Amino acid sequence: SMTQNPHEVARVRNLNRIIMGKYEIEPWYFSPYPIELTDEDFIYIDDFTLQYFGSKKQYERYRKKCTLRHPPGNEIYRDDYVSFFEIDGRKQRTWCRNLCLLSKLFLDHKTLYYDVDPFLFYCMTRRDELGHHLVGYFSKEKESADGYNVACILTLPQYQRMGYGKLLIEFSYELSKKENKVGSPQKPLSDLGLLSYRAYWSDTLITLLVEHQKEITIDEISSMTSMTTTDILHTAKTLNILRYYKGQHIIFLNEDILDRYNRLKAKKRRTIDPNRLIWKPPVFTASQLRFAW
């Protein structure tokens, strides 16, 4: 509706403390939630619809009537650990807006100037007796001309330090591998996301270089991992892989690098299984690549 108070005081205030589902989280950055809610002790976030509440009684009446128990979209991936839901921003406007309002509380460079229409939201969840619980997500432009396979990526604070951030990145490149396109995350990464990406870049690189045996090319590395040639050479510089010895360029896999390779093979970290990815790239027409009217 067009019913908004022109004399309503507009003051920037972060939320005191949110209660998403069973966890009590403290927001780090400002998110444009309703001005009335920014001056409340507790805000309730439904962990299924991501709807915000300032009144506990309303959150009770909402919970007793809400029948949604999983992200409103098609399940494109599911193993015995986590599941992935593909959600269109133009189809699920209400849900995607609530996700962006929630995500802005913890993303400093995320912006809500425009609507969620031009974005595809891939949400990673954990199935439970109650249903699928959102633990993290990464947004993706519908048809990125800049080759950005990840716009904004976030793992919820109550599910941090559990390897979920590495799964979002790995699943993001897995979608790019299915699209037969190279990709790179959107340029202004946060401190937390930058470290997680440097970890994924170095680990998947050393695993590939060791097992390849045959002579490799920079363009071929980009074909197998869907990483951009810039990210590959930057990862090759972070490590001491690339050396120019006696008038020619070679790859050096020294023992210190091979020690991290041996640790990775014995480690039992969660990985994405491509065989459980039942997903064909969405096809948009010229009319569909516009804001809804």
Partner: peptide, 5 residues
């Protein structure tokens, strides 16, 4: 723009 700023 691009979801970042």
């Amino acid at each position: 723009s691009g979801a970042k700023d």
